[PDB]
Amino acid sequence: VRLPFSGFRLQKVLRESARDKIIFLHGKVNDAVVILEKTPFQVEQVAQLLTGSPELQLQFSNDIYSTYHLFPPRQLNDVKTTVVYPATEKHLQKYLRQDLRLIRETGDDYRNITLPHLESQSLSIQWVYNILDKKAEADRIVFENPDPSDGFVLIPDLKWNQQQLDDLYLIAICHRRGIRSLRDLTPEHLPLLRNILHQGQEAILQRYRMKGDHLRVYLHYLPSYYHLHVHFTALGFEAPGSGVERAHLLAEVIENLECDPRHYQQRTLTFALRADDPLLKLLQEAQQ
Amino acid sequence: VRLPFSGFRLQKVLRESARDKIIFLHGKVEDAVVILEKTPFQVEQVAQLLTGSPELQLQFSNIYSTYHLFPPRQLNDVKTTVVYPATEKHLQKYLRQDLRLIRETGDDYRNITLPHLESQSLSIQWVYNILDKKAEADRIVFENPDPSDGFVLIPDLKWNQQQLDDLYLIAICHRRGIRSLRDLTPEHLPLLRNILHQGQEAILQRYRMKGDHLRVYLHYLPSYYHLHVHFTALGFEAPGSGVERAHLLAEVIENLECDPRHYQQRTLTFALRADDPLLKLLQEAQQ
Numbered sequence: 369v370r371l372p373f374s375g376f377r378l379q380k381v382l383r384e385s386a387r388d389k390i391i392f393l394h395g396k397v398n399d400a401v402v403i404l405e406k407t408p409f410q411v412e413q414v415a416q417l418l419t420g421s422p423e424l425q426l427q428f429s430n431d432i433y434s435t436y437h438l439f440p441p442r443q444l445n446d447v448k449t450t451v452v453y454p455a456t457e458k459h460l461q462k463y464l465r466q467d468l469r470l471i472r473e474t475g476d477d478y479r480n481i482t483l484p485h486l487e488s489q490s491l492s493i494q495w496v497y498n499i500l501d502k503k504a505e506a507d508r509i510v511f512e513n514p515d516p517s518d519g520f521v522l523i524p525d526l527k528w529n530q531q532q533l534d535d536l537y538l539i540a541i542c543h544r545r546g547i548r549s550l551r552d553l554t555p556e557h558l559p560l561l562r563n564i565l566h567q568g569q570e571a572i573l574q575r576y577r578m579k580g581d582h583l584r585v586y587l588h589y590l591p592s593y594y595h596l597h598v599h600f601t602a603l604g605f606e607a608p609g610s611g612v613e614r615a616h617l618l619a620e621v622i623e624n625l626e627c628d629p630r631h632y633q634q635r636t637l638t639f640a641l642r643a644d645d646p647l648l649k650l651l652q653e654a655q656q
Numbered sequence: 657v658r659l660p661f662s663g664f665r666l667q668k669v670l671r672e673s674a675r676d677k678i679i680f681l682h683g684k685v686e687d688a689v690v691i692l693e694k695t696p697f698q699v700e701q702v703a704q705l706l707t708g709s710p711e712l713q714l715q716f717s718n719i720y721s722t723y724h725l726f727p728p729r730q731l732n733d734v735k736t737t738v739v740y741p742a743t744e745k746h747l748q749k750y751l752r753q754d755l756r757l758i759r760e761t762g763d764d765y766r767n768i769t770l771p772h773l774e775s776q777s778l779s780i781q782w783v784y785n786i787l788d789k790k791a792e793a794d795r796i797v798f799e800n801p802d803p804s805d806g807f808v809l810i811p812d813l814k815w816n817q818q819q820l821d822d823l824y825l826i827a828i829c830h831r832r833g834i835r836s837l838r839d840l841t842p843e844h845l846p847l848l849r850n851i852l853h854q855g856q857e858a859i860l861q862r863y864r865m866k867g868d869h870l871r872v873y874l875h876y877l878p879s880y881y882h883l884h885v886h887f888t889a890l891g892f893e894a895p896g897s898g899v900e901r902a903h904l905l906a907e908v909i910e911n912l913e914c915d916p917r918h919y920q921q922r923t924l925t926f927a928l929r930a931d932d933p934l935l936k937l938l939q940e941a942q943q
């Protein structure tokens with residue numbers, strides 16, 4: 369009934385998520401990670417509490433709505449506490465997560481700052497080509513249009529174990545090379561984009577029995593690697609990644625191109641960067 | 657204080673989630689919805705608890721060890737929201753349902769969605785209360801009182817105001833009759849900009865949070881049909897901030913600048929519940 373160490377000095381919040389009601393703490397002892405997570409409610413305990421006189425403090429009241437701070441008895445307050453002692457530097461590194469900042473990249477900013485900065489790094493996407501010519505992961509191919517210009521390869525995301533449909537996640541990687549991102553799309557890629565959208569959906573209906581209206585289909589701007597690929601996710605599955613600051617629906621990307629051929633070269637795209645990403649600093653410096 | 661009703665007979669669990677530790681309850685008291693949500697942690701006060709004497713209880717063990725922790729009163733705050741009297745619309749709104757996506761064309765909005773929308777929607781009495789100062793007046797963060805281009809920025813109902821990690825404010829325009837994104841024309845640009853700029857700058861004044869820490873957007877299919885803009889901490893993955901729901905204000909403004917008839921002509925994408933009559937009406941029109 370005690371911690372495996374004496375005393376706890378907070379050195380750094382490695383990561384928090386108010387959505388999941390969780391925190392990851394790094395504290396020195398006497399190196400150790402503590403993790404605190406609020407628990408699910410039990411229906412009967414809450415219902416029992418609400419027939420009575422719960423300890424409440426009013427936050428506000430408007431018409432039929434009202435909110436409060438409730439301070440319930442012991443039974444509902446359980447915090448799942450996961451300690452990690454000792455902690456190597458590799459444990460502290462895998463929990464660390466950087467604050468994100470928003471950036472609004474005009475078309476000119478892309479050509480002058482982002483693109484040059486990207487060309488100065490040499491992101492190897494050799495792994496992608498190995499999938500495309502089946503040197504790697506051929507067993508995982510769900511569907512393929514083999515057309516070198518307008519085709520693609522559909523594969524399940526590495527983390528989706530495939531044992532349920534709640535969290536269905538696939539990605540489509542285009543066969544054609546040199547499409548770095550959203551920024552390179554023009555009406556020329558419309559047939560490719562249409563193939564991914566409608567053949568991708570038809571593929572998933574066949575393999576997994578999931579209708580098209582159960583699919584969020586999108587690209588990421590700022591993607592993690594620079595060779596066009598599209599995400600197909602179950603709609604019921606909510607993660608960061610389908611957020612508006614990063615996800616662009618393929619269907620809408622296609623319609624933008626049909627209405628406005630130069631949309632993705634001329635228009636301003638909004639995305640988030642880690643606060644320590646040199647690109648963030650370079651875009652800021654150029655915008656003031 | 658006390659709840660605005662007495663008793664509570666659980667009729668049904670509308671929605672229950674282990675992921676984000678929240679429960680939505682339909683009770684008789686006359687209907688009421690009572691929402692209970694576990695709260696984010698306060699950093700300086702967890703560090704205090706751990707260094708003193710925690711109340712622990714071993715469960716699993718190995719370097720991985722697991723416990724049940726029962727903290728003192730301060731860390732146990734549960735965000736409690738009551739709708740009372742709840743209407744039939746409230747009961748369906750919060751009920752766990754299978755969601756389907758729909759791509760609503762400009763014509764689908766005029767012939768199907770809007771006429772359905774004009775039949776009925778949730779009362780907007782709370783919005784009129786904020787604007788007329790009969791409720792929540794002492795929580796106003798910034799008001800531009802211009803009838804047409806003005807708004808009131810106020811803490812969202814969802815936010816318990818205890819930490820910044822889940823900062824959440826809404827800007828509600830003073831001008832009536834702007835039901836949603838689909839009514840926005842270039843004449844609304846000065847308003848939308850006022851919300852973007854004056855809204856962000858007010859957040860900078862009050863909370864010291866820069867605008868690049870902020871996600872600022874509208875919901876399409878909003879639950880309440882009187883234009884209002886959401887302001888959340890970027891680091892907060894807020895429900896309703898997914899691409900199938902949220903439209904960045906700065907992007908809406910620029911859409912309007914490039915193409916004046918954008919939100920009347922273009923196809924929007926949103927999710928509807930399976931028990932939503934709108935979904936069936938739209939699906940019949942598209943088959």
Ligand SMILES: C[n+]1cn([C@@H]2O[C@H](COP(=O)(O)OP(=O)(O)O)[C@@H](O)[C@H]2O)c2nc(N)[nH]c(=O)c21
Nearest residue numbers: 430433782810811812813814875878879880896
């Ligand atoms: C009844 N009511 C609803 N809200 C908020 O206003 C927003 C309405 O936003 P919406 O875009 O119409 O969709 P949503 O209900 O699924 O989020 C919500 O985020 C609520 O948290 C409210 N916010 C305040 N401050 N006061 C209220 O009385 C009130």
Ligand SMILES: C[n+]1cn([C@@H]2O[C@H](COP(=O)(O)O)[C@@H](O)[C@H]2O)c2nc(N)[nH]c(=O)c21
Nearest residue numbers: 495496499505523524525526527539592593
């Ligand atoms: C090296 N690699 C990266 N990815 C995907 O690309 C994204 C970025 O990966 P990183 O964590 O290496 O930046 C992830 O979502 C992965 O799903 C990869 N996906 C597959 N299927 N196979 C690979 O070997 C591979």
